[PDB]
């Protein structure tokens, strides 16, 4: 799967105004609250690390063992393509959703070990067949815990603006072109309040 995207940063002081602008020009938003745990094979190559995502927006913070009562999406994110400066970014992204018992332990059995984990807090909008997410990456107050509070990595942490769309087949030239065209439309639509550009991933 191919992910075409644009990235931008929104200072904490402008958050309110940018969100209202996004609500005035786009469809949405829907809240985003995800728990991510990353596993690496047991120069390191992170594009081969397993990135597990659980939607904690649908959990009881009181649930002592939420990780076993959840569905995890498993991702493999490659490095974005180079020489695409001044153009939208592109990177390979593969996904598979897995359940049954404790996925965490299953991936360790496959030969992987825990690397790091974090929480994503934000809003998600939609327009021109693309998704625009504005979020902050947080740190659990206790490893593998969904019980607040969650701490920012820095007190003057900006919000990240990530605009993207997915194309199933990289070979489909028409689909790829329609996606870049859609990103371009969203870019100018948000250019009045946020600079979006290709950033390496």
């Amino acid at each position: 799967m191919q992910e075409l995207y644009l990235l931008g940063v929104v200072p904490s002081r402008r958050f309110e105004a940018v969100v209202n602008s996004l609500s005035k020009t786009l469809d949405g938003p829907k809240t985003i609250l995800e728990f991510w745990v990353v596993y690496r094979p047991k120069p390191r190559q992170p594009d081969s690390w397993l990135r597990l995502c659980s939607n904690i927006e649908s959990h009881d913070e009181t649930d002592t063992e939420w990780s076993k009562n959840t569905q995890w999406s498993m991702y493999l994110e490659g490095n974005s393509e180079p020489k695409r400066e001044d153009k939208c970014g592109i990177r390979p992204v593969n996904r598979a959703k897995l359940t049954n018992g404790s996925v965490t332990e299953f991936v360790e059995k496959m030969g992987y070990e825990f690397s790091h984990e974090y929480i994503i807090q934000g809003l998600e909008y939609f327009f021109f067949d693309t998704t625009v997410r504005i979020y902050q990456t947080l740190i659990p107050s206790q490893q593998r815990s969904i019980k607040p509070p969650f701490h920012p990595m820095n007190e003057e942490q900006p919000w990240i603006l990530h605009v993207y769309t997915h194309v199933a087949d990289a070979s489909n030239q028409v689909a790829m072109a329609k996606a870049e065209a859609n990103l371009t439309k969203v870019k100018t639509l948000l250019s009045a309040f946020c600079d979006l550009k290709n950033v390496r991933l």
């Binding site: 940063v9 991510w36 990353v38 994110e77």
Partner: peptide
């Protein structure tokens, strides 16, 4: 500076590397 934060935050999510700026 917010652009430096972006780079460090993106790096952390990607490789778990925590820059000094991200305490």
């Amino acid at each position: 500076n917010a652009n430096q934060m972006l780079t460090d935050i993106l790096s952390f999510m990607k490789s778990g590397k925590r820059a000094a700026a991200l305490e």
